[PDB]
Design an enzyme around this catalytic site. Structure first.
Site, PDB file in Angstrom:
ATOM      1  N   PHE A  76       0.817  -1.215   0.000  1.00 55.40           N
ATOM      2  CA  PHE A  76       0.000   0.000   0.000  1.00 55.40           C
ATOM      3  C   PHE A  76       0.851   1.265   0.000  1.00 55.40           C
ATOM      4  CE2 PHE A  76      -3.490  -2.602   2.050  1.00 55.40           C
ATOM      5  CZ  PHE A  76      -4.106  -2.777   0.827  1.00 55.40           C
ATOM      6  N   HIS A  77       1.970   1.262   0.732  1.00 53.57           N
ATOM      7  CA  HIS A  77       2.847   2.433   0.749  1.00 53.57           C
ATOM      8  C   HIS A  77       3.578   2.607  -0.579  1.00 53.57           C
ATOM      9  CE1 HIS A  77       3.662   4.109   5.062  1.00 53.57           C
ATOM     10  NE2 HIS A  77       2.381   4.147   4.742  1.00 53.57           N
ATOM     11  N   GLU A  78       3.965   1.496  -1.220  1.00 52.39           N
ATOM     12  CA  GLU A  78       4.601   1.567  -2.533  1.00 52.39           C
ATOM     13  C   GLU A  78       3.615   2.009  -3.607  1.00 52.39           C
ATOM     14  OE1 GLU A  78       4.488  -1.070  -5.167  1.00 52.39           O
ATOM     15  OE2 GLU A  78       6.249  -0.500  -6.344  1.00 52.39           O
TER      16      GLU A  78
END
Ligand code: 3VV
Ligand code: 3VV
Lengths: 380, 380
Positions: free
Chosen positions: A315-317
């Site tokens: 999700f952060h990527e």
């Protein structure tokens, strides 16, 4: 107890007061340049009207819920439909942010809304499957289905600042409108303060020669705190703007029963403790949908923490690297470094003190932390 | 809630970490130089053994209390003796700090102990006069006088961190000795942090060309906040070292019943509110001995606040200007400016908000505040 938090903006007006008072009106020399949205007039961008094009998939989830609740097809087929609907939730807005491209910040907030809508959708699917499995044990079923009110409950859950769908929600009162405006005014001034502290502190300090860090660091460990302390204040003000101000405003306009999102993240004796603490709704999402289904049977927690942080890394990527379309995998590896870190600082905090654990937490959050994501986000 | 206070020393280790790690052992390049006491060995200074020469005057107050309680002389004569004893408390340690002189910091702590012992003496005289006037209404008197226990009560009041004498005091337990050491260790590291932040921030920024300020200030109002924000952190750490650490340690070793000294001074909506808030014992001394005897009859509060701040100006001038023996009257006028200020910011806070009152409080405390006393104290 609010004055010591209040002093941190007194010292920011006070240091470089001069470059605060050289502006004409409401940062007249720095307007629509930091935290910027160009062409405020019209305000019609083809990804901004495609920010409501991800809302036809909650309607698609309601149509497949109507297929399974009117017995059009069996439960497994609808589960496959939920899987493809939330994978089109991955594959379609990345095609929106690559083809017919736009600005980087609009792509970042579109990917953040994509991530939030994906969690809200998977939580809606899991809660609907849980209440369908609870309701199919007997022949009670559901008289007075009220599909307008179910549509309004799903849409009200979609605008809500929580990631756990229930058809009945706690409510509050919306009679305090001057308070709503005051919080909004506080949010806008902090936004302007955010743009001021980004242009005055981080932007002259990143715009120089930089090198990738290695295992050996001699005469280079002073940069990763000096260029991180204004980034530490940027992430503190980002936390105050999102979780204390914008989520409380969106709780109040929708009349939510709990302004419970931020909870005591500053007294973190370790990370791992910190990641279960720093926001209520995404931590409730991991302990309701991924960790505890792993802990029902046959998987222990000593791979469940790694797979939960793997999907948080995904999700952060997807939030950071996709709108810059560069595929660095630096926020991926920078938060995959945290997963052995939670275990480490727990072995360090054992036979030790909570106070020096909080010291080493703030050191970890300085160097290998969440302001590192903002540092790499302002390094492209 | 202690982690956000804890972050303020993380960012001080983090910014200029390099000049923290260039020392050998326990600030090996800066030792006995800032917050300094030269010749730690022997530690015998002729004003340090004259810091116990002000303890013969509490014994003199006990002898004149023994004269009036054994009916050697009338009450008015003893009152005159109290007046001369506490005026010798003014006139003798200034003769100690001028003739056979010593260092400036030893003179500053001798004048601070002189001020504290003067308040403790005047409070002892007023409380003894009040209980003598209460006991002389009837013929109860005082059987079992216990003059050893009265001597121990007066001496225990003299080492106590409060300025209101009662013969019966609330007590506590002294079983937590590892806590006492931990607070002492916290005090010593902060002292070293105080010397580090004074030598790294204030000392290069004061040692330049300076001018006296006037009524008109064009292109000079940026200095009075930029050279005051590290002074703001110095006064915050001074408050934490004295009122939260040293007074709590001296409460614990004497087994005191209330660690109540500091109380909520950061949420000051105005000064005047702040001066009644910032420490309990001296504010209890003004509301028990000077303000409320003025408010018994024939004097209103609208000269009582001026005469209480006049005697506080006399104490601050005796604390600061006398050990430097320069007679500047800048801390006198700088706190005489505050006396119209309490009235002003109260007219400003009316028809206004408490939040922007706290904003203008921290601005007032920045420029015309208590870090100004430390700025003039490090300007000689
Ligand atoms: C149309 C648009 C509308 C928009 C509307 C507004 C927006 C919406 C608003 C808001 C949504 C969010 C907005 C931002 C989203 C940004 C995108 C992202 O997704 S960024 C993700 C970053 N990554 C993470 O956040 C990882 C989070 N990780 C975790 O939470 C944890 O680290 C976890 C769950 C993976 C591991 O937790 P451990 O520390 O808890 O586990 P242990 O060692 O096992 O201890 C468990 C025990 O902890 C206690 N515990 C303490 N507090 C607890 C609690 N609250 N719940 C349960 N147990 C708790 C209990 O004793 C428990 O065990 P017993 O359950 O009793 O067996
Ligand atoms: C052998 C050695 C041993 C050593 C041992 C260790 C050391 C000892 C330890 C510790 C001792 C101290 C160590 C440091 C000393 C350094 C030297 C100095 O002396 S530096 C002095 C700096 N200057 C000041 O501190 C000025 C202080 N000024 C004040 O406190 C006030 O400004 C004052 C009293 C002059 C004016 O007070 P307004 O704001 O209160 O007055 P309004 O407008 O009239 O309001 C009064 C009302 O406030 C409320 N109020 C709120 N809190 C109150 C309270 N606590 N008490 C009473 N009323 C209170 C009540 O409603 C009250 O009225 P209702 O009494 O009911 O008629």
């Amino acid at each position: 107890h609010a004055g010591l938090f209040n002093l941190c903006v007194v010292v920011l007006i006070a240091v470089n007061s001069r470059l605060i008072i050289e502006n004409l009106m409401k940062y007249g020399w720095l307007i629509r340049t930091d935290f910027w949205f160009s062409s405020r007039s019209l305000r019609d961008w083809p990804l901004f009207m495609c920010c409501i094009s991800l809302s036809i998939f909650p309607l698609a989830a309601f149509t497949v819920e109507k297929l399974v609740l009117q017995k059009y097809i069996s439960e497994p087929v609808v589960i496959f439909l939920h899987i493809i609907i939330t994978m089109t939730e991955v594959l379609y807005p990345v095609y929106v942010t690559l083809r017919c491209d736009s600005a980087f910040l609009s792509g970042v907030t579109l990917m953040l809304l994509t991530c939030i809508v994906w969690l809200k959708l998977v939580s809606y699917a899991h809660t609907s499957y849980d209440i369908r499995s609870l309701a199919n044990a007997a022949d009670k079923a559901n008289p007075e289905v009220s599909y307008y009110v179910s549509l309004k409950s799903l849409a009200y859950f979609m605008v809500a600042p929580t990631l756990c769908y229930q058809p009945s929600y706690p409510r509050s009162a919306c009679i305090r409108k001057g308070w709503v405006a005051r919080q909004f005014a506080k949010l806008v001034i902090f936004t302007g303060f955010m743009g001021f502290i980004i242009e005055q502190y981080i932007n002259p300090i990143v715009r120089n020669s930089k090198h990738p860090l290695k295992g050996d660091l001699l005469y280079a460990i002073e940069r990763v705190l000096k260029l991180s302390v204004p980034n530490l204040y940027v992430w503190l003000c980002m936390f105050y703007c999102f979780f204390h101000l914008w989520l409380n405003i969106l709780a109040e306009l929708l009349c939510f029963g709990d302004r419970e999102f931020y909870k005591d993240w500053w007294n973190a004796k370790s990370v791992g403790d910190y990641w279960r603490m720093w926001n209520m709704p995404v931590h409730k999402w991991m302990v309701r949908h991924i960790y505890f289904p792993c802990l029902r049977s046959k998987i222990p927690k000593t791979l469940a923490i790694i797979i939960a942080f793997l999907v948080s890394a995904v999700f952060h990527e997807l939030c950071i690297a996709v709108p810059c379309r560069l595929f660095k995998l630096w926020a991926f590896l920078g938060i995959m470094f945290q997963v052995p870190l939670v275990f480490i600082t727990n072995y360090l905090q054992e036979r030790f003190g909570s106070t020096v654990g909080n010291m080493i937490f703030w050191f970890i959050f300085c160097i290998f932390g969440q302001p590192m994501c903002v540092l790499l986000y302002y390094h492209d």
